[PDB]
Design a binder for these strands. Sequence first.
RNA 1: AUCCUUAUGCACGGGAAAUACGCAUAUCAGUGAGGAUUCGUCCGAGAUUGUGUUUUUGCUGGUUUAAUUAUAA
Lengths: 636, 205
Amino acid sequence: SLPEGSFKRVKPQYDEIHIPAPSKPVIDYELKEITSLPDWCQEAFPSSETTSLNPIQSKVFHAAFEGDSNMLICAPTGSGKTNIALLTVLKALSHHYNPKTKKLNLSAFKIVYIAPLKALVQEQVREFQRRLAFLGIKVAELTGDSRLSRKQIDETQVLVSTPEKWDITTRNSNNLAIVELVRLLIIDEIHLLHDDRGPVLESIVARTFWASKYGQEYPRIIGLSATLPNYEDVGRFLRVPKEGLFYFDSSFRPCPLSQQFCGIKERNSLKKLKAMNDACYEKVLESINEGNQIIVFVHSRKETSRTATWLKNKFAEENITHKLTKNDAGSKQILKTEAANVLDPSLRKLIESGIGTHHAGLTRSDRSLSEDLFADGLLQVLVCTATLAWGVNLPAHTVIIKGTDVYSPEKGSWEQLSPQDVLQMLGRAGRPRYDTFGEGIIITDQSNVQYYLSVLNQQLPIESQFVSKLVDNLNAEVVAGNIKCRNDAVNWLAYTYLYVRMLASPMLYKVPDISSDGQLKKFRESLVHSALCILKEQELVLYDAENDVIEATDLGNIASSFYINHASMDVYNRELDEHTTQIDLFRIFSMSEEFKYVSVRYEEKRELKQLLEKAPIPIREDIDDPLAKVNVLLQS
Amino acid sequence: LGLLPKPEPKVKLSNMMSVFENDQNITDPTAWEKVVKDQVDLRKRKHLEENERRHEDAIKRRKEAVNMNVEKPTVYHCKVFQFKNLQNPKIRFKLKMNSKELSLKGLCLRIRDDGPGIIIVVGNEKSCKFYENLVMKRIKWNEDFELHTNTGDIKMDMHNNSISKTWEGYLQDCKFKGWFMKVCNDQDSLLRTLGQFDSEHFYSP
RNA sequence: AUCCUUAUGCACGGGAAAUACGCAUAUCAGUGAGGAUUCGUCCGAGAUUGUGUUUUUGCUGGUUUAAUUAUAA
């Protein structure tokens, strides 16, 4: 703690603590060069700028060729991960691909790359194409908007999928040949397990080990993640051999992250918000004089525009010219070409000032435009929601996170910024390629700073949320037919990620059994009981308490196929009726649980009002209710 | 500029009802009574405390106040008295302590017990005068006392015993390093005893 | 060693005023500022001049909802 805070500044509005940049790594190792590779692998790095691998990569690489084993990398994800995955891919290709005969063996190996987001999948795919073009490989996307069919999967070799669509592809019974063919299963951002999509990954993992026992040849599993505690427990979840585990701290990061907080001493929201804006302004003023390109995160998208307006009138009151003093002719040109043409959320004026913003709710084209302009650097300041850290790789020298309380429809309450989101926001930083270090900043209330220091140290385990997704995963598995009884269910649950975590800390995750049942036999079986009661109530699976026999129903099969959540499922069950009509169909569709996170907005409200007058299919609900918004959007 | 802690309202009983500091003005009535009351006694203590800090530290400055040596005064005030009977012990003890706290060069002689004799005190004028007030005024030399003797105490009649000032004045150089009461039985060894300090003439037959 | 006294300083509790207070390289002023009266005397430290604030100094109080993505084709 004491080494972390070096220096603290006290200011009238706020008390700011300035953490120094992390330490540079000790060298016990050799930087591994490219000429050490075999013949075909030397084009793995077609542009070899250093001709030597980064501090993280070399050791993990030679270990990766040396062993064929399940591996885990907890790393800054400083662009180091992309190349490592590429290299393991090339190894599998060489194992199925002869060194002498240069014909690539296409039908032997198959590869899967699990990237949480569609956009990041896209980016990855272009990377894999660039690096793998010399072998003559088809690298194509299996997920979502990708829209690959029954055939192209067979044709392709390397796959880049999102977790959801990969889950649904491997869940289906007919394709199992492809699943067996895949030798190489790469999991990017295994730290996702903390978040509620992570349940899908652990379910996929469980299916890989447990579900294919009739062919029974286990594929190579490579986890790739941001640095996280309880790495050992992660390995015990997967298989991981002790040597495959590589834990690298932030000292191995390309640009050391200078951590900074401002505690806010104010309480009432009207002065508190003003104090935050003042602090942000002060930071921006310190940054831009150094020629620093800056990002300011916020909670909500509506917050972005008003924040940028505040920076325009305030920042401009201070000095107008300095933001663009250079190439003002070309800045006027490019700015008018971009802002004036495609933008229509009254965001053009912000672009024109040269403080822009990016958020969900900005047009797809406008969105790409803002990214590009901020890359060129006519945009000095970029106000953003949480989309960028999660999605896009583009780093920016200074990163400010404004505020604590985010509203989550999960609770229906304002919670604190969750650590897993904070960390990935801090990830985008001073550019590893160009700049030397980053500036992280967190605009926050002082009382919660004590919390953010620790959670920002990344001492927090990847929390297992399997409790919510357990039921649906179990149903899908019964549909596969792999579980005929409670004992089978708990054996599958032994390879489940919550199992490990329970073993580590039973009372944290509410194991009553504790001393009893070291293997948590009765705890596992009790969860299965709990699941199969509600499933049976939803007529998803057949179950009997004392006799214990399991079988899958038609509704359960449907939920498995289209990956409907169990809540959505029972909603359909009751709300659909014999006499239900066209009006009620849209209402039920709206009621689908996947829209629970949807809510009506005040900038949306005028267009909603115009719609619902002329809407052909009537709405029983009203403008204030999100369901009505959903089904009118459906009509549109 | 932020360096120091922002102040906070002092809150008294009278003031307690008013304060809109966020803290349990009503909701916790008594727990709020608490923080207030202990707030006051916090301060009040700190007062007494601080006083004791300067008090003690200055007493250490009293040890240092002794550590300097006397800066012997270049010219010496003096006073001389003549008295029939010193026989009352508590007198003598007074004349021991008081002379001693007051840093008084000099002596006291007399003739055996009954013998009248001389009193000499030398030093700064401030102390010498006080010592005089002590001797002449407060202490009553016609006032009889009951003396401890071998078996017990008996009547000793002082109303004959009489004390009077001879004079007071200045002296070139004090030959007295410290003050001692003593006896020399005759007048001669008594006068001679003065004469070792060359003091014979101070006595008046 | 104890107490009182006096002045000054740090304080603590409490009240009072904020037509009050300042400030000034000003100008003078016990080597008399100023005043009084019973006309004999008595009283004995600030006044002038300019200037600034003065319904005030600092602070603090209440009314005019993140991202993301899943079908069998």
